[PDB]
Amino acid sequence: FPAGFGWAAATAAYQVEGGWDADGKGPCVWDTFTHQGGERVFKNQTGDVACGSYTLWEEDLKCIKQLGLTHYRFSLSWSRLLPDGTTGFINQKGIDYYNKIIDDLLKNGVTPIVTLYHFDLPQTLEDQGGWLSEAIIESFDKYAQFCFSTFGDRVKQWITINEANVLSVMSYDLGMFPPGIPHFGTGGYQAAHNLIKAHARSWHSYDSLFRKKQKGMVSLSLFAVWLEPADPNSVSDQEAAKRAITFHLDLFAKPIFIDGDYPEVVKSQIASMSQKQGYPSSRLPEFTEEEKKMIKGTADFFAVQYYTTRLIKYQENKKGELGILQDAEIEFFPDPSWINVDWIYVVPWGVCKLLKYIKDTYNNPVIYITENGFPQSDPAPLDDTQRWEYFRQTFQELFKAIQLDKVNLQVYCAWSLLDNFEWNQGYSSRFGLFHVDFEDPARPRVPYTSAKEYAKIIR
Numbered sequence: 001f002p003a004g005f006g007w008a009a010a011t012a013a014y015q016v017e018g019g020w021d022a023d024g025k026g027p028c029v030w031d032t033f034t035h036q037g038g039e040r041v042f043k044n045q046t047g048d049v050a051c052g053s054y055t056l057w058e059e060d061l062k063c064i065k066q067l068g069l070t071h072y073r074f075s076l077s078w079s080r081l082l083p084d085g086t087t088g089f090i091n092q093k094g095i096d097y098y099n100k101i102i103d104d105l106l107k108n109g110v111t112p113i114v115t116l117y118h119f120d121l122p123q124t125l126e127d128q129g130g131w132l133s134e135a136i137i138e139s140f141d142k143y144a145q146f147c148f149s150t151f152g153d154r155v156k157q158w159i160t161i162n163e164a165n166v167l168s169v170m171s172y173d174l175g176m177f178p179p180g181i182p183h184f185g186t187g188g189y190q191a192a193h194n195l196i197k198a199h200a201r202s203w204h205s206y207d208s209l210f211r212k213k214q215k216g217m218v219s220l221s222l223f224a225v226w227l228e229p230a231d232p233n234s235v236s237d238q239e240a241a242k243r244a245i246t247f248h249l250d251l252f253a254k255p256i257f258i259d260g261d262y263p264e265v266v267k268s269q270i271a272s273m274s275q276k277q278g279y280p281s282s283r284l285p286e287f288t289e290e291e292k293k294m295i296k297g298t299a300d301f302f303a304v305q306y307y308t309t310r311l312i313k314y315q316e317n318k319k320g321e322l323g324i325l326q327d328a329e330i331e332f333f334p335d336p337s338w339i340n341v342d343w344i345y346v347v348p349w350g351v352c353k354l355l356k357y358i359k360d361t362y363n364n365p366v367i368y369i370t371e372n373g374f375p376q377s378d379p380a381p382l383d384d385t386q387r388w389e390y391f392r393q394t395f396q397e398l399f400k401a402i403q404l405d406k407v408n409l410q411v412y413c414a415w416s417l418l419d420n421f422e423w424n425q426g427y428s429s430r431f432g433l434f435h436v437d438f439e440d441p442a443r444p445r446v447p448y449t450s451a452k453e454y455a456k457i458i459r
């Protein structure tokens, strides 16, 4: 912890807000998804109410204040602000609401960090192809412009798209998020393409239209699992684990932070294999030469969201097999003496290695951890000393990264002010620094030991 370092906790519109059809709000895709049932969400839970944050925002403020956060990361509800997705119909109640969060945040001396989009397309926009249609690029840019215009007089730190990588894979490649149709090996790259251009244009709208007057900074956040060779000094695995990084992280960061084009490994591997089943073209779409000039250097800081490490081994696509992006000839798993809670294997030395990697691959950028954290399964909590130790270690290696490795880290943001709707997991996993009880109509917030113990770290 150097400089005037920022400590923050993130929330996300759909995961905490409720009021899904309150005050003019248009349906978003999770509204349609969770209302459909099937066993897509744990127990068919919805975010109709979630933490009730659209109604109990001062409760959130109280927690923020109690933590003494220097910053606070939340997202804007695209369909709360623009019910049909466009500026053709503006919801003043949505505007009043985010205006209040921001104003309250500034009067308590806390700096807002605003995600424009967090896995939550307006239903209207998804009906028109979602991130599969390039029509989306213009849609997002106009929405982004609207957000800068309305909130930018006093918001100076923006994340445009939250985890576009996790988004393209879960929404369109794996079919796990809405719109929930599988598409193994085509969906993800097809979305990723549009998410890259849409982020890119949105950045250029900000640089052109608001940056002079507003003086803020803008990027997008990326999910990074840090990867290690299953067996080390076993040569194949060594390059496999590197290649799997370029596939999940650099597929987005190379174009945006460097040179404006996909990584070379990626282009060759997908193309080659697309000859495969006799696709008439690669499944990695192509950036035009014009596009590359638009996309490059289109980020004001590097923003990662870290949670875990994995071990990776080589796995030849002996008999070509569809995409799953994995069929870039990798297989992943944990080293067997790691602690877990669902998907998050507690490997805190991973962020340090991840942070020098970023410094090494992206010319020493300013970095924010815009999400880091650990969940607990329904009952475990309050005196969550197990979990808090996990946090301690993570900060310990964070210290090492700044000191020994000289990484330009300026923000640590913890994933999560509140226990909330964790997508398919529903309320069955709890990443909050503050417990929330979803059974009483109030939605009371009580600190975890972590909450109290994170306040101290904010030295």
Ligand SMILES: *[C@@H]1O[C@H](CO)[C@@H](O[C@@H]2O[C@H](CO)[C@@H](O)[C@H](O)[C@H]2NC(C)=O)[C@H](O)[C@H]1NC(C)=O
Pocket: 036, 037, 038, 039, 043, 044
């Ligand atoms: C989640 O909601 C779905 C509805 O989409 C439930 O589906 C029902 O499943 C039961 C058997 O478990 C069937 O008898 C019903 O016919 C199904 N409902 C309909 C109308 O399709 C599902 O049971 C729910 N699961 C949980 C765990 O709550």
